[PDB]
Subunit: 348 residues, 4 copies
């Protein structure tokens, strides 16, 4: 050439996203939602720092692919949230995407129509809409943040947030966490590395900068204040790491690092060895721990839907199309089991 | 009750990419150097050419004057060894860290906690343009999904670091970077995350970023066919023939390019800069014997050797310790001679 | 350091960008067909290819979307009724420029209380414009600035540049890039030269500054607008009569631009008296019956209820210039249709 | 789906936001001081708190920054020499509006070749404006649209709204938020009322659409500009003489706005003849000697070299309106200095 091309050589298309502010204008957080979010955050902070011995329970589908079923799930769960409010602090898992190495559906935000149309403007509007409806009905929500831009669209509706095993060591994700309004859980690494999560809590506690967009949708540098409400999530690795031996080892490491030694345990994913029928075993092991001692457990995580298992196409209502989940009946047993176990712990 | 930006001190709009692009447009010559160098590196990744890519330079740039002088010296050697080595300057603006400390030239250019990013972005672009204009291609690590909009048009080779190789969004980024991309193996030696990254990054993805004009955007990528692995050590170093052979088998097994890069520094030197030469000597011996799966090396080098906590000495690192200029001359002559023998078979 | 920037500015507030409104209110297929078709139909009148009369008719200003829609439903019946003689397009002006303090219109101040809720005002304007086209009623508007068109010009079948801006270079540059045909009003005191010059200017390629659909400062490069014409709206004295029309047509021909024009029955032509709009229309009818070859359109200020009021108390009654009511509007349209039917039969 | 959007648009491209230019060319302390003081000094003249004569003087249009700066160096000596009698501010206008095709000025088309490199034009305009303020020469300009002021109004000590836009509502809204004092020109044909009306309007709070310094669609809420005044530039006939000044003053007083005004020596007051600016100046000088209490300023079109040329071949000679040369400028300023020196004895 004269001028050889060097910009966007491997880019098919860049399209504007509607700014966060457009979504916020259509769907402003209500007074009720605001109160629920503010309260639930403070309450979760109390658990993280050992000021309250109630058990945080992040529970719900692996991924949200159908708002209607999410809203029905929320209705059922709400009754249990209330029933168990003295023993457990129940928050719905509302993740819009499962990260994956191979190609496949990129979730409800990226691809709301489930057909590779990538209608993100729609997806983001749908995602905000659901999160607002959840908070309005009295069901707080949690989610995993996969990038540094989506939080501007709906983090104001999030009571608890996660950074996944594949990004816990990522500098920029730690930076993000240090500025999220909600408490944040850092999952241990894919193969069980706990150190990255312990390091992440220390890092995310401090002030940081990272790049994102303003609510008006423009390139921005963000200066964080630190997030003092971070904690570990044990989700297994090569072997599961839910039992008392592992919880006690993690707590030693946490204390040795001088960060909170209250942690959360995932009943699904690697701790269930990718088998949804084993989540109850994990919970039952956690129940047992809480009865004997369990001083370092502040939370658990469970993959649960209306209907159990999984499907590869979205044919059955309330049935996951990502990781398999325990159905509603087992959800009822699992929660009873945890509430009764924790009732005793709080009394001791 | 407030629920938004509870833990945010400030959100500040940046000058858009178009502003920096207006002040510092890529020149014709620089676009040719970038275009050519990218293809040349693609040829190494895909086994078309047997020159050895050498990504060499400071751990991190904290002073552009010293980087330009470094580049001037390096350029003569890039030219001298062009039939055996494809020399490209390491121009990394930041070293990621867990503890508190300096966040690099882009984030904090004045080295004083002022975080003058607009200036940092300008200075980074300015340096990269100057380097390309003098004949020196540049390489960098991309730590997020927005900075590439400011200066990726000037980068001939990019890296994704050990701590981000497994991150989905960073792989999605890699899938639309105009340059070839190296993925580093995990902090403790995990090669699979890099092998998976190359696979993921060869496909078309979507990720969020900004347009050149600074507006929140969705990016639809075409996939990046020119990705490869970088061996940078783990619990043990992984630079030797035995580790190379195992990585190459796993790469072939995965159906991705089995040509890789070996970092002489970081966890392969185990943070002793004086051990880089020893790693390079082992690499040289591999190239002389066979070394068919090696397409490149990485070396942390500066004008003056070692490191210092404050930028007192000119041309000396304030992040990881580097070999100095004399050792650099020796290492490059060494690798040139060894690869000459490889290429002749 | 002394401050020198924004010294007399209370506030600068970023708006929602056009793309935000366009996403909530995309133009429908049906509204697109109507807009596209009506612009071409008007082009054909402007250039003498069709002899139907363009009738820009409706409220002085829109202050109540409900009444606007009711007005449209009634007007639609007549648009259809007279479609062989008249091309009826609804007047949908959101603001009346004024010199003194007062309401700045439905876009700038939709709540009519000086809250200046512009985001709401732009949304409601777009929404009203979309509902109008969807029911079969094309819309017309005056563009007062260079940024508002990005929010709703896609919904506009005919656009005006008023007496106070016809001579404005930047408004001529705007007109040169508007998707719709454009009418330029003669000056406040009757100056026609500014409108003739405007047509010439607007037919050529220009640049002017605005925003992109995403809301970013932009330079706009236009193709030129071949479908501009003049609008006679009076001055010191009215200029609607055959003798004024005749002279304006000669001056248009001498400038090498279209000698087909529009006559406003209202404003300075009615001497600010809405009960004279019918007399102007009667004079126009008499011209169309005799010859009237240079008339391609008329403008009428019309509402559900006649007159004007200071506060919006009575439903369907103007809060800006006094308009004829619905009954008078039926008579005025019958008169014009009847006169033009005869013109078209020659 | 028929197309309805941007049908007659060739291209919309982003403009660098104001903040990009402000980052590269921040106002200096010195320039901020000069601007601040000069604006204050001019408001004093507008309201008759001081009796020095504002002289807006310089090229019709800027097409070459080098000549502009050279011109400024020469003017600076006389600005200093006459500082007790005259307040000399350089005319730094980047474009002359026109009806026919031709050069669209230094901002729109800095390369004088039809390439419309507007980013470069805005940059060059701000650059020149900053250099002028830094050397000690304050600057004045005409604002043609609602966006360009965001790029350099912080460097402007006096602004003009031209004859073709004085009646424009949006341009009055702009004026009401401009940090400098503003002169409104009488109409093209001599109409003074639009300018008197403009002063009233611009004194109040208004809204208008523009962009934020960051380059995004915005609504601007202004505070009102108390420092507006009329500029008499002729029309149907020259309006520089004592009788016309007296009529204008009476009319200003009746509208309850400042009866201090500016008289343009050029344009229609010179009958388009650059050799008559000295004659107008002489008439003004005789008024200042006798009484001239309503005069607060004059405008003059002046360059290094007299006359005009179609192509920018000769250095320092206008390619728009013909100007007096540097020699006649020296004579014209000495004349006005001496006459106002006498006026100031009363
Ligand atoms: N708005 C986020 C914080 C954030 C700001 C800016 C960018 C990204 C995230 C929260 O309230 O948690
Ligand atoms: N501009 C980048 C690709 C990219 C586009 C958009 C966002 C991020 C990265 C390149 O040429 O490599
Ligand atoms: N979008 C307008 C033209 C326009 C573009 C940009 C700014 C202003 C107006 C139309 O289609 O008529
Ligand atoms: N910045 C201008 C005022 C202004 C603001 C916004 C838009 C246009 C003009 C000044 O200081 O005079
Ligand atoms: Cl934008
Ligand atoms: Cl656009
Ligand atoms: Cl602003
Ligand atoms: Mn899952
Ligand atoms: Mn390093
Ligand atoms: Mn009216
Ligand atoms: Mn002139």
């Amino acid at each position: 050439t004269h001028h050889y091309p060097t910009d966007d050589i491997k880019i098919k298309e860049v399209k504007e996203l509607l700014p966060p502010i457009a979504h916020l204008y259509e769907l402003p957080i209500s007074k009720e939602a605001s109160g629920l979010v503010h309260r639930t955050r403070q309450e979760i902070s109390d658990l993280v720092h050992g000021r309250d011995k109630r058990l945080l329970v992040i529970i719900g589908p692996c991924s949200i692919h159908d708002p209607k079923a999410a809203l029905e799930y929320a209705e059922r769960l709400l009754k249990l949230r209330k029933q168990y409010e003295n023993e457990l602090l129940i928050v719905m898992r509302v993740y819009f995407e499962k990260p994956r190495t191979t190609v496949g559906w990129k979730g409800l935000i990226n691809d709301p129509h489930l057909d590779g149309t990538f209608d993100i403007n729609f997806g983001l509007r749908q995602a905000r809409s659901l999160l607002l409806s959840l908070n309005n009905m009295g069901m707080p929500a949690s989610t995993e943040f996969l990038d540094m831009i989506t939080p501007q669209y709906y983090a104001d509706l999030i009571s608890w947030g996660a950074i996944g095993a594949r990004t816990t060591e990522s500098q920029v994700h730690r930076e993000l966490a240090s500025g999220l309004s909600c408490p944040v859980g850092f999952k241990n690494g894919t193969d069980g590395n706990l150190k990255i999560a312990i390091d992440a809590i220390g890092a995310a506690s401090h002030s940081h900068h990272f790049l994102s967009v303003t609510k008006a949708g423009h390139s921005a540098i963000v200066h964080t204040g630190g997030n003092p409400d971070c904690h570990v999530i044990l989700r297994g690795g090569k072997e599961p790491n839910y039992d008392a031996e592992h919880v006690s080892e993690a707590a030693e490491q946490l204390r040795a690092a001088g960060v909170t030694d209250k942690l959360m345990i995932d009943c699904s994913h690697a701790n269930s060895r990718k088998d949804y029928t084993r989540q109850m075993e994990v919970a039952q092991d956690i129940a047992a721990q809480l009865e004997q001692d369990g001083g370092n457990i502040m939370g658990v995580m469970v993959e649960s839907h209306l209907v159990e298992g999984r499907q590869d196409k979205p044919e059955v209502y309330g049935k996951s199309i990502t990781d398999a989940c325990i159905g509603w009946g087992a959800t009822e047993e699992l929660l009873a089991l945890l509430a009764g176990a924790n009732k005793k712990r709080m009394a001791r």
